Structures are given as C-alpha cells and as structure tokens.
Design an enzyme around this catalytic site. Sequence first.
Site, PDB file in Angstrom:
ATOM      1  N   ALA A   1       0.909  -1.149   0.000  1.00 56.03           N
ATOM      2  CA  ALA A   1       0.000   0.000   0.000  1.00 56.03           C
ATOM      3  C   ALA A   1       0.942   1.191   0.000  1.00 56.03           C
ATOM      4  O   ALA A   1       2.076   1.082   0.471  1.00 56.03           O
ATOM      5  CB  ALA A   1      -0.865   0.019   1.271  1.00 56.03           C
ATOM      6  N   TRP A   2       0.490   2.327  -0.510  1.00 57.64           N
ATOM      7  CA  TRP A   2       1.359   3.487  -0.558  1.00 57.64           C
ATOM      8  C   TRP A   2       1.811   3.923   0.830  1.00 57.64           C
ATOM      9  O   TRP A   2       2.936   4.396   0.991  1.00 57.64           O
ATOM     10  CB  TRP A   2       0.670   4.656  -1.281  1.00 57.64           C
TER      11      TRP A   2
ATOM     12  N   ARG B   1      -2.677   2.348  -4.286  1.00 59.08           N
ATOM     13  CA  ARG B   1      -3.489   3.420  -3.739  1.00 59.08           C
ATOM     14  C   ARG B   1      -4.926   3.030  -4.016  1.00 59.08           C
ATOM     15  O   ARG B   1      -5.183   2.139  -4.822  1.00 59.08           O
ATOM     16  CB  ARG B   1      -3.183   4.752  -4.429  1.00 59.08           C
TER      17      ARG B   1
ATOM     18  N   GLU C   1      -9.276 -12.244  -5.426  1.00 58.02           N
ATOM     19  CA  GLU C   1      -7.919 -11.912  -5.861  1.00 58.02           C
ATOM     20  C   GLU C   1      -6.961 -12.132  -4.696  1.00 58.02           C
ATOM     21  O   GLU C   1      -5.905 -12.758  -4.844  1.00 58.02           O
ATOM     22  CB  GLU C   1      -7.823 -10.448  -6.309  1.00 58.02           C
TER      23      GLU C   1
END
Lengths: 136, 137
Positions: free
Chosen positions: A11-12, A41, A77
């Site tokens: 994650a950013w 993001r 996913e």
Amino acid sequence: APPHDIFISHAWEDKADFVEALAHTLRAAGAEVWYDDFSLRPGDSLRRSIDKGLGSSRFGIVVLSTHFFKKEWPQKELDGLFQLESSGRSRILPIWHKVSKDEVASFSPTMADKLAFNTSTKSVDEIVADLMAIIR
Amino acid sequence: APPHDIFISHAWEDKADFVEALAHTLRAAGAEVWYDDFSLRPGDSLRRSIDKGLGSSRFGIVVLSTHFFKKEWPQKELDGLFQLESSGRSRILPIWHKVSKDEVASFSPTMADKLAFNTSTKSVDEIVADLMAIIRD
C-alpha cells in the site's frame, strides 16, 4: 531469465517507513529489486499489478499490513495471491507487518503452511537473509 | 457437512429491506442461505442465536447497523461474535450498514477496529462476490 529478482507489492502508506528500508537492505545483500511502481493506492487493480510484477520478476513480496487490507481488495484476488505453483515453488512471499490477528480475520487470505514472514518475529536482516536463501 | 453455508444474524427491522435483498443475491450466486429464524429483538439472546447458526452453517454474517446497535446487547452477549478459528479467520463475518465508525465504537470499541465488509464501500454484489470467495477458497 527475468530482469528483476523481486518486486515489492505494498500500500502506498507503507512505502516510506518499511518498503524503502526492506528494498535497500535487499539491494545491499545482492538482490535486484524494483518497487516504485508497486505502491497501491485506492482505485488500483491488485491483480493487474501483481501480473506486471511476475511478468518480469522471479519472485514477489506482498506487505500485508493494516493499510494494505484497508484498501478493500476482492477476496477472490486476495485469496489467489498465495496459491502455490504447480511446481511446488512459491512465487509470492507475504510479509505480515504490524497487524493484529483478531483485527484482520475477516480478510485474512488463505495461504500455504508457514509460508509467510512476520516482522514481529523477525527483523529486516533476518528476513532478507531468508529471502536471499530463497533467491539462490 | 453443514447443511447451510451461511446464516445472517440481523435486527428484525433490517429483515424486510436489506437482509432479504442480500439473501436473494447470495442464493443467486450459489450460496445456501437461511436467516428467517435469526431476526433479533431487544432481550433475545444473541449468544444462543449465534451458537445455533454456527451449529448448522459454515459461516455466519452479522449485519451491523443502528438497528442492531439500538438493541442494547450486554458485553457478555457480544463476546461470542468475535470467536476465531485455527485458520486465524472468524466464522462470523460482519457487514457495516449505514453506520459511522464513531457510531460503531460507541456500541463496541473492539468491533470498531476489526476490519469488515462495508456496504458504504462495496455494493451488495461486490460483497457477495467476496462471500462466495470465502465460502469456496
């Protein structure tokens, strides 16, 4: 052979205080690493990113932190990211980072047996030593 | 082994509109769902209701809304709603519905920090896809 040994999916929010550090420790250990284009993001496609990664990298690391889970990916996913290869070989290695087990159980992905790293049980050096063992 | 895949715990007020819509969508996707004998009213024992639901279902869902909050469940009644399995995963999946986080914290601090499904961030379909993934994978 692929031009990259490892790509770090994250994650950013984890880029500044962990990923940058993990990557630098890896590169100094001898691994070729890329991650600038792998900061997730809100809005990004997780599978599309993972595909671009395995597309030219030998392995992949996914930083499973609270920020990663809060991005609210499709459980299909997510559950997929950690399916082992029909070759027995593991291509995507997860690293749990600063999370509570109880806190993230509704999204905890179905993975292999004792296949993940945990910065709670190991330091960056220890994990990089292991990863290098895996890259060789 | 379990005759049901999912039971949906919810406050009676949410049966009519939400839970029904959700139940239809889930069944249409292939899940075996029951929830009629799982509507809750002030006083009822969330405790026993959960045991029952888990006794014949694989997973349970609890709709966390203002209506379910205004039932005033004692702490000892909420405790079972967190239980975790060996996999580290819980057999009770919560779904936040039209509620604010501060609102959640007011009802239960621990619950406000547990990652969950949120109809404010995903459509019922997206949530149903996640639930089917959890039922299968």
